[PDB]
């Protein structure tokens, strides 16, 4: 309700508020992946600032990256999205990989990226 | 191949380590180009015209 | 076959996302210049 459609300050504070409260819960990583799935899958028609919301999600994951479930669930989404190789949703994969890439590098030859 | 092309533009554009894959594109995406192609296929007068229209309507019903 | 054998280097939504996260460009000013000769004058002015 708030982070997708809210104002930047409301968006930022809601995201930061959600991290501080529920960032340490086991289901937190699943929530991030579910949000990622629901909001960025190519079947989503909802119009919203994907880039601004994505920056928030990257920020949110970084501030909750101490929760082992964050990266676990994010890679499970990437695992499931790539299952067709082993139909692929390339835009969804791009969002997930970039989120996963930014989160992992927070966890020199790649400094060019 | 008109039916195959309709399937590619509307239903499934994926290929039928050396085999072509073309996994990179979402199915059914539209542009001015796809719209023009579909319109010319539909409104082109030939023996297959009927069949092509049939395919189109089929995809409509399937979607619904 | 060739379409199979090539990957598109044109920029895509990943490059757009990187841009959202903030003709050629001189990177010398950003670099550090050194020399193997101990007696060389420091060349940062270059």
């Amino acid at each position: 309700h708030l982070c997708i459609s809210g104002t930047p300050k409301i968006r930022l504070h809601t995201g930061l508020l959600l991290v501080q409260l529920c960032g340490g819960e086991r289901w937190w990583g699943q929530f991030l992946s579910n949000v990622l799935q629901e909001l960025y899958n190519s079947e989503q028609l909802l119009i919203f600032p994907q880039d601004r919301v994505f920056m928030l999600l990257s920020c949110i994951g970084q501030r909750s990256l101490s929760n082992s479930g964050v990266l676990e669930s994010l890679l499970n989404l990437l695992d499931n999205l790539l299952s067709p190789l082993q139909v692929l949703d390339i835009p969804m994969i791009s969002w997930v990989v970039m989120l996963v890439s930014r989160l992992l590098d927070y966890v020199n030859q790649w400094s060019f990226i | 191949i008109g039916l195959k092309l309709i399937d590619i533009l509307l239903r499934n554009c994926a290929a039928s380590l050396n085999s072509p894959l073309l996994f990179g594109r979402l199915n059914g995406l539209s542009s001015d180009s796809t719209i023009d192609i579909l319109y010319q296929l539909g409104t082109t007068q030939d023996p297959g015209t009927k069949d092509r229209i049939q395919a189109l309507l089929k995809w409509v019903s399937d979607s619904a | 076959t060739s379409t199979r054998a090539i990957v598109n280097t044109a920029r895509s939504m990943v490059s757009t996302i990187m841009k959202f996260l903030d003709g050629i460009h001189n990177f010398a000013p950003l670099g550090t210049i050194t020399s193997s000769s101990p007696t060389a004058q420091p060349a940062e002015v270059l």
Binding site: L75, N76, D79, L82 | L22 | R4, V7, N8
Partner: peptide
């Protein structure tokens, strides 16, 4: 790290599957 292998294997397949 079995799921890690799975995603990495699928990532390589994706790498190997990348075309135009």
């Amino acid at each position: 790290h079995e799921r890690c292998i799975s995603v990495v294997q699928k990532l390589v397949l994706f790498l190997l599957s990348m075309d135009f």
